[PDB]
Design an enzyme around this catalytic site. Structure first.
Site, PDB file in Angstrom:
ATOM      1  N   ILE A 173       3.074   4.246  -3.702  1.00 48.06           N
ATOM      2  CA  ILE A 173       3.571   5.056  -4.830  1.00 48.06           C
ATOM      3  C   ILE A 173       5.069   5.265  -4.638  1.00 48.06           C
ATOM      4  CG2 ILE A 173       3.365   7.286  -6.075  1.00 48.06           C
ATOM      5  CD1 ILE A 173       0.700   6.174  -6.043  1.00 48.06           C
ATOM      6  N   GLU A 192      -5.520   4.037  -1.650  1.00 46.48           N
ATOM      7  CA  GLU A 192      -6.472   3.847  -0.557  1.00 46.48           C
ATOM      8  C   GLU A 192      -7.853   3.377  -1.005  1.00 46.48           C
ATOM      9  OE1 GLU A 192      -5.038   3.620   1.970  1.00 46.48           O
ATOM     10  OE2 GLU A 192      -3.989   5.397   2.728  1.00 46.48           O
ATOM     11  N   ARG A 198      -7.540  -0.408  -1.445  1.00 44.69           N
ATOM     12  CA  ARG A 198      -7.487  -1.087  -0.158  1.00 44.69           C
ATOM     13  C   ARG A 198      -8.834  -1.209   0.479  1.00 44.69           C
ATOM     14  NH1 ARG A 198      -2.508   2.606   1.484  1.00 44.69           N
ATOM     15  NH2 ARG A 198      -0.753   1.295   0.813  1.00 44.69           N
TER      16      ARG A 198
END
Length: 246
Positions: A71, A160, A163
């Site tokens: 970000i 996250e 990922r």
């Protein structure tokens, strides 16, 4: 750009969003069947725009570096806020250039500074879809302590989750109620870049890791990944950080 709308969000539509987000990150190769993120992109194309809407249909547009899924900053109608770090000032060059006003947050966007700024570690902040809706809301009005805490939830519920498929499932579970992340998920969060390097260092080493990543994960305390057949590799990790940026 990828959009998500908390209004009438359920675990499926969030899965769709998280899929959409992965599908926006460019890559050239797969390493052991996982996309390897480019080492750099240049121009305004390094940045992906997420349009997020809260339950009342208010929106923020977040900007994500497509080479590491960090970000960079975000826009709340006419103001943009970027983190206080060099990449983020670089990003500022390419995105939200018609914001009437640009604020630099008094911290950089990493977990350690953001937690210091927020007053709680990640382990004590609930995540879920309700929290993401509350983070979006927080962000629409400047308060830099409130934003440290809402950006902790925003990062984890988007980046996250892209990922790691485990974390995407954590959030799905927490679609109608918030809950602190598992030790498992904090571990994963911390290991992305180590995992990413070891998986890459394993091509030409027979799928074997040169140094074994020890996760807390779901063996309570203390697991060790040592090769690529492990399921955090075969089933979990979804995106690799290119070793040029590790």
């Amino acid at each position: 750009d990828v959009s998500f709308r908390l209004s009438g969000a359920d675990p499926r539509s969030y899965g769709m969003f998280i899929k959409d987000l992965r599908n926006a990150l460019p890559f050239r190769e797969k390493v052991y069947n996982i996309p390897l993120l480019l080492p750099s992109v240049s121009g305004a194309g390094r940045y992906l725009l997420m349009h997020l809407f809260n339950r009342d249909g208010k929106t923020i547009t977040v900007a994500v570096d497509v080479t590491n899924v960090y970000i960079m900053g975000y826009l709340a109608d006419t103001t943009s806020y970027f983190f206080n770090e060099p990449a983020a000032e670089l990003a500022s060059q390419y995105v939200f250039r018609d914001a009437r006003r640009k604020i630099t947050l008094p911290y950089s966007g990493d977990y350690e500074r953001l937690q210091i700024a927020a007053g709680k570690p990640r382990e004590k902040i609930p995540i879920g879809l309700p929290a993401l809706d509350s983070a979006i809301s927080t962000l629409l009005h400047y308060d830099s302590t409130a934003a440290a805490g809402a950006l902790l939830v925003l990062i984890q519920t988007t980046a996250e989750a892209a990922r790691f498929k485990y974390i995407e499932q954590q959030i799905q579970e927490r679609a109608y109620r918030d809950e602190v992340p598992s030790l498992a998920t904090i571990s994963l969060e911390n290991s992305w870049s180590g995992l990413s390097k070891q998986i890459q260092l394993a091509q030409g080493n027979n799928g074997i890791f040169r140094t074994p990543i020890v996760l807390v994960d779901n063996k309570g305390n203390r697991v060790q990944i040592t090769n690529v057949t492990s399921k955090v590799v075969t089933s979990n990790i979804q995106l690799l950080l290119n070793t040029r940026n590790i």
